[PDB]
């Protein structure tokens, strides 16, 4: 059984990584220029885009790649590090509103995870929770197109 | 430092 | 919730052949869509409201191998290209769509869900054209609306230079009519 | 002549899950 989403950690924190097009993508503010662990030693980033807050290493062991979205739906579904699914309505290229606001803690450690369309395909990578007094009401994300362009 | 994989999530819920 | 799917092979070539002839299959059933096969070809059967439907051009007028022996079809409609056996003990049934959505999602034999835009009562267009082989063995499979309800069953691809650009499907209405 | 046999399945009802270690 292969997984599209990896739950990763640094000494500092934990977050997610999403395998798309054979690349294991995550948030630069989480991994930085950090190399990823491998049974044969640290493997370096295949892409590092600080401007986009995006990094990617070759897809790891025990993973399968997620397909990018091609239907253009605005009904997204964010997957958290706890495997929760959160409906999000796309408000723009890199922003969408949670159909039901959640405590900031709910989305903690899920940055890097995917935002799926109704077909389960990748619309983008969860970048940051947009909160108002501890309640995340919306989210920031990196469109798959950026990933597609970085490659 | 180095990023480490501590777990995996399967979107389809496919059991082993 | 986003439509995600996964496949599992329950038996192989020789085990299939024997079970075909024997007509007795003791394997446990799970799922909404059963990958099915004859000595000739493989296709999909979709369980909707307690009936396991599939395409007639695949199942013909054959019985389905069950734990109690072969099971005779409940419905047969050569013209509409349908056949239905009572759903196997263990499968889960989908339910017909009640939202009239035109944004459909086709589930392939390899558990891949692809988007198709409804372009008529029995046709939809692949938003992303794929070679016909990707669709190989998917007849009888489901076309779901955004909520996961059955809109139709994939009947035949509409390809050109070997690239499928659209698909012809059996709208779940023909099912209600076949049972009538 | 010859029964149709189930050789696999496709499950739509599964929800995202963290793969267990075993
Ligand atoms: Zn999509
Ligand atoms: Zn519907």
Rg of chain B over CA atoms, in angstroms?
Answer: 11
Residue D8 in contact with residue C34, Cβ under 8 Å? yes
Q: Distance (Å) from the C-alpha of residue C60 to the closest C-alpha of chain D?
A: 9
For residue B10, list chain A residues with Cβ-Cβ distance below 8 A: 1-4
Residue A147 C-beta-side C-alpha neighbours within 13 Å = 32
Structure tokens at C117: 């835009």
Is C99 assigned to a binding site?
yes
Residues 6+ apart with CB under 8 A from D19: A1, A3, B7, B8, B9, B10, B16
C-alpha span between A27 and C163 (Å, rounded): 37
In whole angstroms, give the CA distance from residue C6 to residue A96: 28
Experimental method: X-ray
Nearest-angstrom CA–CA distance, C59 and C44: 10
Strands C113-118 and C103-107: antiparallel
**Rg (Cα) of chain A, in Å, rounded?**
14
Subunits with at least 3 CB pairs below 8 A relative to chain C? A, B, D
Backbone φ/ψ region at A51: left (φ over 0), alpha (ψ -120 to 50), beta = alpha
C-alpha to C-alpha distance for D10 and C9, rounded to whole angstroms:
9
Interval between CA B4 and ligand 2 midpoint (Å)? 42
* Residue D4, min C-alpha distance to chain A (Å): 28
Q: Kindly determine whether residue A1 and residue D15, on different chains, have CB atoms separated by under 8 Å.
A: no
Would you say C148 and C110 are in contact if contact means Cβ atoms under 8 Å apart?
no
Exposed/middle/buried for residue C26 (C-beta within 10 Å: 0-12, 13-18, 19+): exposed
Name the nearest CA neighbour of C54 among C154, C126, C123: C154
Provide DSSP, A8-59: EE-SS-EEEEEEETTEEEEEHHHHTT-EE--TTS-B--SEEETTTTEEEEE-
Strands A14-20 and A23-27: antiparallel
Q: CA–CA separation, A18 vs A31, rounded Å?
A: 13
Q: Which of C84, C124, C137, C140 is catalytic?
A: C137
Structure-token pair, residue A81? 């590090």
User: Out of C37, C66, C81, C138, which one is annotated catalytic?
Assistant: C81
Distance C123 CA to ligand 1 centre (A): 19
Residues facing A49 on adjacent strands: A54
Distance between CA atoms of residues A8 and A31, nearest Å: 9
Q: Report the first-to-last Cα separation within chain B, whole angstroms.
A: 32
CA distance C172 to A26: 42
Instruction: Tell whether C7 lies on the interface with D, counting CB pairs under 8 A.
Output: yes
Q: How many CA atoms lie within 13 A of D2 on its CB side?
A: 12
CB-based contacts of C146, cutoff 8 Å, min separation 6: A73, A75, A118, C99, C101, C103, C105
Cα–Cα distance measured from residue C32 to residue B5, given in angstroms and rounded to the nearest whole number: 33
Return the C-alpha torsion angle A125, A130, A131, A135, nearest 10. Answer: -40
Task: Choose, from C37, C66, C138, C139, the residue flagged as catalytic.
Answer: C139
Put simply, the answer to whether A83 touches D15 (Cβ < 8 Å) is: yes
How many residues would you count in chain B? 16
CB C171 within 8 A of CB C82: no
Phi and psi, residue C155, nearest 5°:
-110, -45
Catalogue all structural domains in chain C, each as residue range(s) with its CATH number.
1-94 (2.40.10.120), 95-180 (2.40.10.10)
Dihedral pair phi/psi, residue C135, rounded to 5°: -90, -10
B3/A62 touch (CB, cutoff 8 Å), yes or no: no
């Amino acid at each position: 059984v292969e997984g599209e989403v990896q739950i990763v950690s640094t000494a500092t924190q934990t977050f997610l990584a999403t395998c798309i097009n054979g690349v294991c993508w995550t948030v630069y503010h989480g991994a930085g220029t950090r190399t990823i662990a491998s049974p044969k030693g640290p493997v370096i980033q295949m892409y590092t885009n600080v401007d986009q807050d995006l990094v990617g290493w070759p897809a790891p062991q025990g993973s399968r790649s997620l397909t990018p979205c091609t239907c253009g739906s605005s009904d997204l579904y964010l997957v958290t590090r706890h495997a929760d699914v959160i409906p999000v309505r796309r408000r723009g290229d890199s922003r969408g509103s949670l159909l039901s606001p959640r405590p900031i803690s709910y989305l903690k450690g899920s940055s890097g995870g995917p935002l799926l369309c109704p077909a389960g395909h990748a619309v983008g990578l969860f970048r940051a929770a947009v909160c108002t007094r501890g309640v995340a009401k919306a989210v920031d994300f990196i469109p798959v197109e950026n990933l597609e362009t970085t490659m | 430092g180095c990023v480490v994989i501590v777990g995996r999530i399967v979107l389809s819920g496919k059991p082993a």
